């Protein structure tokens, strides 16, 4: 590549300007994507004859 793509690419903490040790650290050691780790919600989204029977 080039130094242009280098600095333009930056990094997680580089582009993030750091400031969060959970951002850099968590996104680094175990990190796949940052900030990536309800029931009645999926029930509502999933929502007479049958009842009668």
């Amino acid at each position: 590549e080039k130094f242009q793509g280098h600095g333009l690419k930056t990094e997680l903490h580089s582009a993030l300007k750091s400031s969060n040790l959970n951002l850099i650290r968590r996104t680094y050691q175990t990190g796949e994507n940052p900030y990536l780790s309800n029931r009645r919600y999926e029930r509502g989204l999933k929502f007479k004859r049958i009842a009668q029977e």
């Binding site: 997680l12 582009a15 993030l16 300007k17 400031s19 969060n20 959970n22 951002l23 968590r26 996104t27 994507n33 940052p34 900030y35 990536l36 780790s37």
Partner: protein, 90 residues
Amino acid sequence: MLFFSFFKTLVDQEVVVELKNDIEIKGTLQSVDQFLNLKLDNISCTDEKKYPHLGSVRNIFIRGSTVRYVYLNKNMVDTNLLQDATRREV
């Protein structure tokens, strides 16, 4: 869960909070939870009138529904990484 991991990611950060009853308090966030309740340390003063009456209290626990906004700075966190995080989750 996205924002859950957002403030779960932001710990020991001075932020300003506005409530539904119009209470605005700056504090250093410490503990987080699934219901997005916040515990601020070093309770500071925002305005004269909007600031409630608490003299000695250095630590608070805010319920997640009561907050209206949460005030940050752009220097505090990068938004784009959260953005592609959003497009990745949903």
